[PDB]
Every structure is written in structure tokens, then in C-alpha cells.
Amino acid sequence: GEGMWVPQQLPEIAGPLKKAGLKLSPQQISDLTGDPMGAVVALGGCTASFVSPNGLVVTNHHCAYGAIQLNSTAENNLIKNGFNAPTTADEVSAGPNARVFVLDEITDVTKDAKAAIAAAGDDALARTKALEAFEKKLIADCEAEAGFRCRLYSFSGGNTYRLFKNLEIKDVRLAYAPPGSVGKFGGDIDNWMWPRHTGDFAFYRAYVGKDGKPAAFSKDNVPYQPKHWLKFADQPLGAGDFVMVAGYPGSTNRYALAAEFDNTAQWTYPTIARHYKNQIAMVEAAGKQNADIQVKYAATMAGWNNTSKNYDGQLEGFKRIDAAGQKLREEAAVLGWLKGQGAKGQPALDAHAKLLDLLEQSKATRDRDLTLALFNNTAMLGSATQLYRLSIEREKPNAERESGYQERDLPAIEGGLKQLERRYVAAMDRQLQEYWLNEYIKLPADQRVAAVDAWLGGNDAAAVKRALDRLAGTKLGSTEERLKWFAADRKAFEASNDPAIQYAVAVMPTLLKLEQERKTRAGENLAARPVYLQALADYKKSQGEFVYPDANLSLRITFGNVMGYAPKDGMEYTPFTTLEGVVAKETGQDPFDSPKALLDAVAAKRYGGLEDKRIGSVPVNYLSDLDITGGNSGSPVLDAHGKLVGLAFDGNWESVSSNWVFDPKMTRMIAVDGRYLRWIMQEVYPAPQLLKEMNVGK
Template identity: 40%
Template sequence: MKFAPKVPGLLLAFAVACGGGQGSTVPATPSAPAEPTPAVATQPAPIDPYLAARAEYANPGGMWMPQQMTLPGHAAAFQKLGVKIDPKNLADPLSAPLGAIVRLNGCSASFVSPDGLVVTNHHCVQSALQVNSTPDNNLVEKGFLAKTRADERSAGPAERVYVEQAFTDVTDAVRGGLDKIADPVARKEESEKRIKQQVAACEKGRPEVRCNVATYFRSGMYVLIEELEIRDVRLVYVPARSVGNYGGEIDNWQWPRHTGDFSFYRAYVGKDGKPADYSADNVPYKPKHHLQVSDKGVSPSDFVMITGFPGRTTRTKTALEVKHDVEWYYPYYLELAQQKYAIAEANLKAPGETAIKAGVLKQRIQNGLEKTGGVLKGLTSGDLLQRKAALDDKVKAWAAAPGREQYKAALAKLEQIITEEQRTARADYDRSNAFSSSQLLASALGIQRWSDERTKPDAERKAGYQDRDMRPAIASHKQLTKQYDATLDRALLRLALVRAIALPAAERPWLPLLLGVKPTQKLDEALVDKTLDSWYRTTKLADEKVRLDLLEKGSEARLRASTDPFIRAARRVWKIYLAEEKRADARTGELMLVAPAYADAMREVLGGLLAPDANSTLRITYGTVKAFKPTDSPFTTGAQILKKNTGKEPFDAPQPLLAAIEKKELGPYASSDGQLPVNFLSDLDTTGGNSGSAVLNDKGELVGLNFDSTIEGVASDVVFDGSIVRKIHVDARYMLWVMDKIDGADHLIEEMGLRPRL
């Protein structure tokens, strides 16, 4: 079936010179003390002619690609809201302020000084704290402050800061002629070949650059993204857990909040200005742009926007897909997550570093557990499913109109593929979960893949296993050494295997192979326990040197001769692993020709204003500071912490913080009513991956950090509803106050172009 997807206008190729990103910065003017002035008659505050429009603004949602900001709808909205910045200025992702926004592993962040200082969320640096912690010096609990740059600690060998350098539309180069390839596997492989060619050309002769091709609009659009990959990332400042995670699981996804969810990294490069592995000789990176942090704050109904890297939404899914998620996937995931949570909780008082690692694991699981539960509740307790079905009907009606036969046929084929995929959903999920639940088993499977791919010419290898991928693979294994815990790893693998036992034998042929028993043997928990006891007692894969040796030099002969139980288990299931991968490739190859039709039809139904689903690429969302009700305040205050605090976790703020609030030692960080703003709400459109995103005013200044959503609106990942979507941000004034008054981070305040006042 020939189908030409409707792709938005081509992206400009915003290319910049490499070599460390030296260049001009956004001016950072230190705040000066006010000069005495003669007394004058008080003038009434000027009337804001746009205040009423902002107060009444109903956010339609949208995580917009930068170049989409030129669409007429945005210009009209900005004009109505009285926004000073021209939306066209936001269409260039390499200019200020977007040029200061960076990507971390799973979070967003921003440069806030000319010396590579990076601000993000407290919960985004937990892994870095964990790898630097010991039972006697638990930084996860205590926090960390480097008084000098020499004191800044490595965030771990796998941590990265990615700086955007170029965006190029390569849709035609990737998709052109794919409809002429009849075999879906061959079609998928051809698209991968073309993507690898684009990446290779982008990275050629530039080891400091990392390129990837991202897909948008259900694979209707492909964009080549070039990033500077900074590999030396260091911890600079993290407040104590009792500030950065105040309220803990009880307050997570809830309002009101009083959480100081902020932290700082610094990006380092070699003396030549190019990315380098960690070294004491490295120097701070000099970004082309950095944000000015504002200590002036925001007010109710003020315009705000967020730029960052949202991870995943599913708004362009069909109603059939959403129905399946509601009826099967979400409930199944929640059951599994609850069991994983119990494992983490049971090890919070375990000896050694297990307790520290269990605490980090528990926080991560709880976050996903509560959000997914909120999505399911939101979709089933209101009218969101009905609204999704109604939009789906409009999409199908548009495609069924005369002259659109290709669209109608594509949508029918899409539903056929989806139905077939759903038929094996649980078996596929349990198999994937089992293969990925253990760090050691996943390592063994990865080592086997590297062994297979190493025999091929580099250009013919599977993406992720080329020469360009060895360095990050080594870094990941070094990070694994710091994060691995045998007790937790065994418990999570056991859970996955026991759950898989419940499947009919025909749907889990891999399980007896993995366990090394005959297909006819009875599988039960006792067998799983006996097998895992032997594996974890005799394996050598927990040894970093062993893993790295096999990763870099593991030949087929060496792996065949290996006696390591995890390597042997991986080899026993390898044929099934490859067969299932090929089945998935065939499905992907079929979807490539028909899935874009659904996104295109949806765009037409919505009048052209459709943001692609989140995919961890740079986006913009805008709206206003807004409470749930016009009569409520969108801010929380320090005084409320005094009433909320119990002295017991998670409501156990540090005594110096409580004392300073009690004495009203708030300095210039207090708002006009004399209160210390802590967190505030907005109606912005964000999701996971936006953690750490800068909240900007209409001057492009940082006024807060995004860190959470209220549970009522999380189903908007599937169907956006601006009336209930509220995002929670830490106010920059609270961040600065904690730095200034509580933790003594004066040198960082000065580095950001401000002055300590307390």
C-alpha cells in the first residue's frame, strides 16, 4: 500500500561549530542593592490590560516542537495573553533561551552560569548521590555541597549532559521508497540502514558529538539530532533529603506541596574544550547560552513556559489502543509495580549499601506506581475515554470521505495490526520483563549480542552495537558496578520468573530453557529459588573486570566455553530472543506504512494544531500560573511548613530552616505579602522527562523548576484536559533562600549573577 504521510514543514538545519561550545552568553547582571531615593507620592500600580485574558485562559495543551512555534495559533495566543517574547524567537532551538536547555539521562536541566553550572531536580540526581554514598556517609540523606570546584564529585561514569547542536529533517531520506519494499522485516531493516547512514555521516570525524534520529507523528517524520555529549558531570550541590524530598511519598503527586526539589551539577570538558572522560585536569564547560535566574518571582495568572525533554505521551494512539491499556496494561503494570515496591521496602533496613540502594529503588518505583494509578483512575472516572472515542470517530470519518481511500485503508490495516499485537500482550510483556529485570541477566544478553554483532562490518551491525556504542556501553557497566546489589537483583528476577510461571506453557517456551530444565518438568517457586541460589553463588558477572573483558573481547568460542550461569542461561534462550525480535521487527515494518496516517488524519481534524507525542526531544509548552480555583492561591509558603512539620520523616525539615522561617528571616526572597513562596502551580503541559525543566517567564528568565504534577491531571498523557491539569514547580525564590540562608551556597548564587542577601 502506497501512502505518503503529511509531514509539517521541513526543519531548518541549525548547525553550529563544535569544539567545546565557546561563545557568547546571555548577559547575567548581578542584582545591586537599592540606592536611597527621596520619598515620592505613591502611584497606583499600572493596570495590566492582559490580566483578565490570562486569568481566563484555558490551556489546550501541547508539547510543541520549536519550529511549530511559527504556527499562527501560537502568535494569536501570545498576543491575547500580552506575552512580550515573539513566539518566532522560540522557533530556533539553538538561540536563547532554548540554547541553554540541556538533556540528562531521563531528566531535563539548564545551564545557569557561564562556567557550565547546571540546575535540575533533586530527584534527578539520586543515582549520583547513591554512587557517592557509603553506610557511614549517606549523601542520599545528608545532601552535598562542594565548597570549591576541587570538591565537586563525579556523578558517575554513565551520567551525561547533552547539549543540542543541530536539528535536520531527514524524513525523505529515511522514508522514501519504503512502500515499494514488500517484506516488512526488510522494510524495517532498510529504514534502520538509512538511519545508521545519517548518524554515521553526522558523527564522522567528531567523537565529541552524539547523533540520533528521532521519530514524530507515529513515524511520519524523522529528525536527525546532533548533540554535544559531555561525559564528565559532577555533583555540585544537593540539599538534604528533608528539603529536596520533603513530604516524600505522602505528598508525591499531591497539592499543596512544600518541596525544595532542586540540585546542581557542573559540566566539565578537556582543556581543549572538547568532551572527555572524568579527569582532574578537566575544566568547566563554557556554554554558548545560559539562563538568568530571577529572584523576582511570578504572580497569579502570570505567563510561564517550560522548555525541556518530555519522555512519552500516547495522545496519538487509537481508541482501540487506549481501551487495551485501560483494560489490561495499566492494571497489570500496577500489580507488578506493587510487588517490586514491596521488595524495595523489605530491604530498607538491610545491612551494608543494600538499604541505600533499596531506598533509591523504592522512590523510583513509587513514582511510577502512583502516576500509572492516577492515569487509570483519570481515564475511567471521568469522560476522557468518551472524548478519546469521539475524536477517534472524527478521525475515521475524515479518512472515510471520498478521495481519501488510502487513509481509510491505512487505518483499517492499523487496527488489524494492533489487534494482533494485543493478542500476545501478556506473554510478550512477561518475557521482556524477565529478560530485563536482572542487571546480570541483561548484561549476559547484551554480551551475547555484542559477540554476534562484532563479527559483522560496523555499518551492518544492529543499532546500539556499533563501534560508536562501545564507549557508552563500557560506562554503563562501570555504573552498574556502583549500583548493583545481589539481594535486590535476585529478588527482582525471582519475581519476574514466578509471574511467568503462571502463563500457559505454550506461551513461555523460553522459561524452561532459561532455567536449564526440560520442557516437561514442572516449574514452581522451589525450582526458581534453587536455580537462582546456584546462579548468584557461582556467577562472576558481578565483577566489573569480568564483564568488561567479555563485553570488549567476548567471542562466540569464549561464550560457548563459559561456565558462568548467566552467560549459559542467555545462550539457551538466544534463538527465541532473536525469533521474537524478528517478529517485532515485522510488526514495526508494517506499522511504518500505516501508522502515520492516523496522526495525519488527527492533525486535519484538529485544524493543523497537533503536537507530536513526547519522545524525549526538545519541546515547549506555555500557559499561566494557575490554582485549581480562582479563589485559591497557586502558591505554598514557608509558614505552612511550620504547621505541616511533625519532626518525623517525611515531614522533618531541618531545624535551621524551621527557625529561619519562624523568625521571618526571609530577606528579599519574600513575596509582597511577606511570605516565603515555596512551590507554585501552573496549567502547563508536561510529563515524565520534564523533571528539572526550567520554568521561564516571558523574558526567558528562570523563575522555577518543574518537578511534579497533581494526580488529578496525569491522564492527560493520553487525553489532555486543561481544566484539571496542574503542574508543580519549586519557586526560584525558595531555591535561592535555601542556598543563601540555610546551606551557605553563596558562591553558587554569585556564580549565577546574583548576590547573597542573608
């Protein structure tokens, strides 16, 4: 059911865990470096887990997709055919940006963080800067030992701070991927849908140097030896059984003010969806003409289609459950309860009023700020502004540089500058520049930016067309020229005639002022959010309820049971799909073109010892009332005993309004059953040596 629990609080919900069917102790699963949770690793946007003592890792197929594609050629197309490395020497590099993060140490630093913050006083901007300086020093000390990357997380609006130290593994290799018509069966048609029949898995192996320390790719590297790895369930997973997921959910907003919900539902989501559908259409149209565009902008357009449809999907969800009235009523209950407290309820009511004040301030400039951020996020302007800003930060001592522009960030910046070549074509980027400038000049007069108005020299189509002609002269389209600017001094930026640079130099004082205004507001938030969130927690507790923090990229556990749902009277989604359902969907055409070996194996009922008699077949995917969101792709599903029964890979469409509210009736995770992994690797695209490594050989 609902809840993204921090592992440290699982002992306080022993009652619900046990009732749902947990057989390990709460204490055992609260150990973030223990068995099983110490097997869970972060890939940087997806979850994965160790599944052998020789560093084999399992995750979703769409999580490995970049690595599979990276190693594919026209005549050896691994996306379509699959990949298998029968020995560890056959494994292929997932590329210099691939990472496995293994948790080494967690520290609660809440006391020192709150002291660093209090020492700043009444000044909001200085509160933000104190916390920045606190965080930077923490990270720098923690990372002084090579091989580790550290992160500071704020929980519950700044009620709690914890510091995570992770081993940063940098040699990650592909070991297995099923054919793409397994890993992505149903493609975009089945996305967010149940019934689901998708074998969404792939395997990596993690490598380090012979000295046991992380290293970049080298033939001299050997597999990492994890301290904990998951084992396949020996018990067949059935309807009603306990399941739990561990992983790194990104962001939820379950505790937001009602007017914060309203502003999102009424403005943010429709504005963004509209813009993204506009951009999607121009890219789709242009890509039909020019296959270079289509290739290079495909990941980009897919990103847009995702968010755009998630937001149409949340919008729709909000209507179905009347999210607006639900928030207003809940907040009315909380505010009435606080009035009923003393004197001692006042600080939280003042905090509430302040948060509404901050929201009003952000709203006054919201068109200006979004349109300017997205204009500047086009490829050449994003690059020029980012490179000029780095040049400005390089004049400061490293400890004072902005996050994102410190020494420790340089490789990721250099990496981004190269990677841009894979997703940039001038004629397309000009069309996006154009769109955004057209949106800009449509802004009301009080939403404008003086620097941009001066640079344009007017507020009409003619000024737009002049600006595009001016900008077309940039050289920042070559990787080689971007890397020159990466190394360049700010005087060089400020003397340049490159028109993308001159735009950056012209706007940057403005960007810094808007940044400083964001940070002032954030400093106020830092004072008021935690006070309000604590009162929410006390209110919930007075009503008998447990509380969990909104997602914030750190490790969480969610639990529940395997179960379908009923979207209307007279019908039910059943909790499992089966092999024969995969074959009923076959059309012989992408995306419903299963490998022949799969069709043959199902026609023959080669169940390979894996069938569950209760469903009459080998299960494919299953539903459960777990609570996940972006970031949880590739999370292991564990049973009551902490054994692997699945990977998370999606949710139902009704789930996506989850971010704001959690609808217990309808919200379900979709997982791929561990038996289906085993079945594919036995009967369809075989990997007997991996199954042997995981002690599930025939």
C-alpha cells in the first residue's frame, strides 16, 4: 500500500510489515548495507541489484538500452537480436558514462546541518548559502578517499539530513539482454498498460581494478565481488503474497499545499504539456524529411512524449479522484487542528502563510521564468551559457564554486559537451529556437527580460527572424569548438564574436539575478517547510497514522501484496499474465513480433519446470499495490523471505496521479516475474552460464 519508507523507520512499522506477510525481521531489512538491501545499487536514474558473488547485476531492459545500442552495429543489431556473454571475457563495455553505485556508509548529519543553517540568522539568501557551504565541505571531506561519491539528502522539507557515501564503480559491462521484442514487447502501445506481457530485464557485470578499487574500463579489470547479492525465490509467488521493492524513487509531492497542487494542475502541467506537444510535432515532421534528425532527436522526442503523456495522465487522474477537493478538505482539517493547538500551533500556521506568500512570488514571474529557462535550454544557448558560467566560477576558489561547476563536476560537464553531438542538428535546433522566441514575444509586457528585449531589438517576427539569422553563425555546433570554450577564460568569452557566446554574455547577469531570487525564496522555504511538515506529521500521528517523507532519490522500501484491481463493476484485472497471453498478442509486426523460439516454446508448452499450477502456466508479469515512481525502474521485487521474485518496470495509467495523491484502489506496480526471466534464459534466448552463476541451472 501507500508509502515510500526510509529503511531506518521500518522497525516502527513492524506491525504493518508483519501483517502484510514479511518473514524477515524489520530490523534485518532496515540494514542499508545488509542482506538483502545492501545488494541494491543505483545506476544513476534506474535501480539494479547484485545477483551473484562475482558482480552480476540485473536491471530492466530499458535501463540497459543505451548500453545495448552503444554496442550494436547495422549488421550486429543487439537491440533486435539480444546479447549474451557466455564467458566474462565476452562482456562488452557499457561505455565511459556507465556507473554502479554501491552504498558504503550512511551518516545522519541533521544536527550539524541545522547548526550551519541557524548560524546564518534572519537573512534567507545567507541561509541558503550556509547550507550550500555546509554541503560542499561535507561532500569534499567524504570524497577525499578516491573511488567514492557522496551525496547529501534533505528529508521532510529539511527536518532530517543524511549523507550517503557510495562506491563509484566505473567499469560496467553488458552481459545479457533478451531480444528487443521480449525486452520491449508491446512497445509504446502497451506503455502504462495492463494486461502486460513484457520481459523487461537485462544484466550487467561490475568490474574494478586488480587492487579492488574502481577504475575506468580496462582489459586488466576483474569482476567486483559484492558483499551481498539477491538469490532467486524457491517459493512460487502467488496472488496475495507479500512483496517488497527497494530502489531510488525520484520525487513525489504528497504533502504539498493545496494551492501548490492547484498551481500545478491548473498552470504547470497544461503549459508544459502544450509546449512539449508543440515541440514533439515539429521534430516528428522534420524527422520524416531528414533521417539524421530523426535518429538524433529520437531520445529527446521520447522524453517529451513521456512527460507530456504523464501530465495529460495525471491531469486525467486528478479529475477521476477529485484531487482538488481532496486536497482542500485535507488541508482544512489540518489547519483547524492547528488552530485547536495552543500558542504552540502558531508557528506552523505562520509557516503555512509564508509558504503561500512564496508561492505567490514564484507565480508572479512564472511565464517569464519558464519560457526563458526553456529558450536557454536549446542546444547552442544551453551550451554557451553553461560554458560561460563555468568560466565565471573558475575564477573563484574551488570550495566557493557553485555546485555543478566544481572540479568534481568537470568530467560530467565535458561528458555532456561531447554527448551533445549525438542529439543536435542545426536545422532542427533553429526550429526550436524559433518556437521559444515566438513564445517569448507573446509574453505579456510585465513578464519580459530587458536584456533579451535589447538583444532582440524589437518584439515582432522580424526581430525573431534577425535573431535566428544572428545565432546561425555560432561555431558551437562542433564538439571540437565546445571543448575549446570548456578550457577558456572568461575574458575570452567576453571578447568573442561568436553570436551564441555573445547572447550568453549579454544575458548572464540576468540569469544570476534570477538565480539569486530563487535562492532567497529557497532560504525562506528552508525556514518554513520543515515547520509545516513537522506539524503535518504530528497531525497524522494524532489521527493514528504513520508518515513517510516524499521521495528524494535516496533508497526506499515499499511493500504490499500481489493483487489485481477492478476498474469497474463486472470486471477485474487478474494479478498475473501468462505465456499464452504473450502469444495471443502476436501479429508478426513490431512491437508484437516475439522471437520464433518463444512462439515455438509456448506452442509446445515447454514450461521448463517453471509453471505455477495456480495459473496453469509460467507467469509473465504481475500487479501489486506497491508504491513506486520514476527512479524505481529496475528495482528488485522481493518476497517475504527477501528472495528475488521480480523486477519493477512500470505502473498502470491510474498510478501516475500518485505523485500528488495515492489511490489505493487503483494504483499498481507492474513487475516482470523472476520465473519469466528464468524461462526466457532457459527456453527462448538461452544463457545457461548465467543461470548457473545464479544457482538456477537445470
